Amino acid sequence: PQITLWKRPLVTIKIGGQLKEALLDTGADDTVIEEMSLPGRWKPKMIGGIGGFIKVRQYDQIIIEIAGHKAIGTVLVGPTPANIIGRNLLTQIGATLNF
Amino acid sequence: PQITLWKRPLVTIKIGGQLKEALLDTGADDTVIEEMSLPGRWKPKMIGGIGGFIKVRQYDQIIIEIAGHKAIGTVLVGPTPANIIGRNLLTQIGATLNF
Ligand SMILES: [Cl-]
Ligand SMILES: [Cl-]
Ligand code: NA
């Protein structure tokens, strides 16, 4: 698709067999999702946002579908105000910004 | 241009007679710049995201040039960790996300 930005670029994702809404975020290095259960072991990570820093759980090699496009990569889980798809997965699905 | 997302999508902007670097951020509703002077009236605002909220000054009808493209809109000024061009100005330069 070609997604304009008059509204927030929200898409449906599928993770763990469940559908969720998430924001396509070119200003995010990483993908961050609200609390949910993911398999395997996690590693610690500190991330920064407009307000300061939060601690998250880093899960690697997670299967995730983004607007119908398959990806497998790192997902951070923590107290984000919104589910965000960052550049680590935007690159996997071939996303570019154009103007 | 077409901008890939292998690295942060930073561009040069001209605002307030000043050149700055800023991040093209589809996950931001609004444009937020580090402390600087702008002309005109302003009013206070709180904006939020991953580590909570910060207080900014809201200036309306500010002319900006973003990678060579002129636009006008609201610019928020305050202690942001990064200069960000959000959707309110991305739309004006015709920016889309494509995949
Ligand atoms: Cl505006
Ligand atoms: Cl348009
Ligand atoms: Na003004």
Swiss-Prot record, chains A, B:
Residue ranges annotated for the Peptidase A2 domain, each copy included: 20-89
Disulphide linkage map: none
Superkingdom of the source species: Viruses
Region (Dimerization of protease): 1-5, 49-55, 88-99
Active site: D25 (for protease activity)
Function, in words: Aspartyl protease that mediates proteolytic cleavages of Gag and Gag-Pol polyproteins during or shortly after the release of the virion from the plasma membrane. Cleavages take place as an ordered, step-wise cascade to yield mature proteins. This process is called maturation. Displays maximal activity during the budding process just prior to particle release from the cell. Also cleaves Nef and Vif, probably concomitantly with viral structural proteins on maturation of virus particles. Hydrolyzes host EIF4GI and PABP1 in order to shut off the capped cellular mRNA translation.
Assembly and oligomerization: Homodimer, whose active site consists of two apposed aspartic acid residues.
Protein's name in the database: Protease
Organism per entry: Human immunodeficiency virus type 1 group M subtype B (isolate BH5) (HIV-1)
